[PDB]
Design an enzyme around this catalytic site. Sequence first.
Site, PDB file in Angstrom:
ATOM      1  N   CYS A 231       0.911  -1.129   0.000  1.00 16.66           N
ATOM      2  CA  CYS A 231       0.000   0.000   0.000  1.00 16.66           C
ATOM      3  C   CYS A 231       0.955   1.184   0.000  1.00 16.66           C
ATOM      4  O   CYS A 231       1.414   1.626   1.062  1.00 16.66           O
ATOM      5  CB  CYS A 231      -0.890   0.048   1.241  1.00 16.66           C
ATOM      6  SG  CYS A 231      -2.038   1.464   1.173  1.00 16.66           S
TER       7      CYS A 231
ATOM      8  N   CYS B 169      -0.458   4.305   1.942  1.00 14.18           N
ATOM      9  CA  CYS B 169      -0.653   4.312   3.393  1.00 14.18           C
ATOM     10  C   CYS B 169      -0.288   2.994   4.093  1.00 14.18           C
ATOM     11  O   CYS B 169       0.853   2.823   4.508  1.00 14.18           O
ATOM     12  CB  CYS B 169      -2.085   4.696   3.770  1.00 14.18           C
ATOM     13  SG  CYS B 169      -3.438   3.870   2.912  1.00 14.18           S
ATOM     14  N   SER B 170      -1.237   2.065   4.226  1.00 13.85           N
ATOM     15  CA  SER B 170      -0.954   0.821   4.955  1.00 13.85           C
ATOM     16  C   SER B 170      -1.975  -0.296   4.746  1.00 13.85           C
ATOM     17  O   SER B 170      -1.954  -1.306   5.454  1.00 13.85           O
ATOM     18  CB  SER B 170      -0.879   1.142   6.448  1.00 13.85           C
ATOM     19  OG  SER B 170      -2.000   1.927   6.836  1.00 13.85           O
ATOM     20  N   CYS B 171      -2.834  -0.109   3.753  1.00 15.08           N
ATOM     21  CA  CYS B 171      -3.900  -1.030   3.393  1.00 15.08           C
ATOM     22  C   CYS B 171      -3.418  -2.481   3.413  1.00 15.08           C
ATOM     23  O   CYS B 171      -2.426  -2.832   2.761  1.00 15.08           O
ATOM     24  CB  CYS B 171      -4.451  -0.630   2.038  1.00 15.08           C
ATOM     25  SG  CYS B 171      -4.915   1.119   2.199  1.00 15.08           S
TER      26      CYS B 171
HETATM   27 CO   LIG Z   1      -2.969   1.753   3.175  1.00 10.53          CO
END
Ligand SMILES: [Co+2]
Lengths: 203, 226
Positions: free
Chosen positions: A107, A110-112
């Site tokens: 991701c 972000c951090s998905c």
């Molecule tokens: Co993310």
Amino acid sequence: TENILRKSDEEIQKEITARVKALESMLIEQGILTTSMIDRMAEIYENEVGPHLGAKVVVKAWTDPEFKKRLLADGTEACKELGIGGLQGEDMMWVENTDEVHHVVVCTLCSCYPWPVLGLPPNWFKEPQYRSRVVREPRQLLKEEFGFEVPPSKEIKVWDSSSEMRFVVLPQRPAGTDGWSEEELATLVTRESMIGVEPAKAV
Amino acid sequence: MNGVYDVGGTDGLGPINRPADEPVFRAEWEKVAFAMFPATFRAGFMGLDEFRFGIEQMNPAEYLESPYYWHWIRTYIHHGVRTGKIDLEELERRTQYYRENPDAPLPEHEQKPELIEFVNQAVYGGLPASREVDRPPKFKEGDVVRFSTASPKGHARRARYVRGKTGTVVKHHGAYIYPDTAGNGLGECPEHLYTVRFTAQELWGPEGDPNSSVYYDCWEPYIELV
Ligand SMILES: [Co+2]
């Protein structure tokens, strides 16, 4: 990396702790946050939802060709057959590693991450180092950071979760596991093998 | 927005810091930060897309080196102030109070069964972003498309590394909440979603891996037919 402008980890933690307790006190007064709500969310992701769930899906796919077909066709629906699904995994797309292709997920924005099958992501996955490099130098990253050497002739497909679609890697079944039980096979499936940064455990 | 947070392709960020193992939550404040996600969502502070945008507006230097969950705290405050649900002056006063009295108690409050119900329902039922639209998909598998060079100043899921690049549609997933409207408080305005394949050579030029490709999800307005 060194930054002469940065406070010590201890000072940073002390400041954050005070800021979070302050915000918490306000949300509590608003009646939208409670101690039991906090404890429930933590309990779920510390002991209920984790990579052992994804492992169950992987071993079923490894030992059931029909389920594997359904898994690759519609990840969300297939995982629901095992009672697996939910928050941040509403839309899952599983991708199969083969002798010709290797998949790795990220991701960059972000951090998905697929919470229902892997639980919350490890810190390195959420950090700028992995996120920035994996889409640009995936082969070098896998080798240098994970000791995973993917031959130049083998294609590396990097999946960037820019939407709500959550990508999960179905690692290849390790050799020398013919006829193993699902429980035994599960010991070879790691969180890393489902992210694509490492293959499933050898032997 | 062209924020630093959009790190895909950025060079010089350093080696990956990866301990052999680690706890899910490294400190009690992290559990609180994490639980505030469904709490603020239920309270109407923001939706998922808006949540992301709040983080994207952080001071880049702070974002790059602060503990992950601190990003979440920043977005809660951002939207709390935006919606008028959080008074910044009171928050600052309480912060100093807890700095000086770290072991001081939290406010007296009643527990709420509905909040536990919400947590269980959200966790196991999810918060699906898929939606039905009246228009059919404009694109299909095999179509060669070009990613938009638009550069919205508000929220969007347009990584700088894919803008203006040509790729091939891999799959149509149906319609979903559109970030460009949702993240900016303009509503769901659902758009068809597609996974598009871009070769490493297309993205990075000669420096790209000769045998690699990146799959990136694009909402309909993001791409045009080639
Ligand atoms: Co993310």
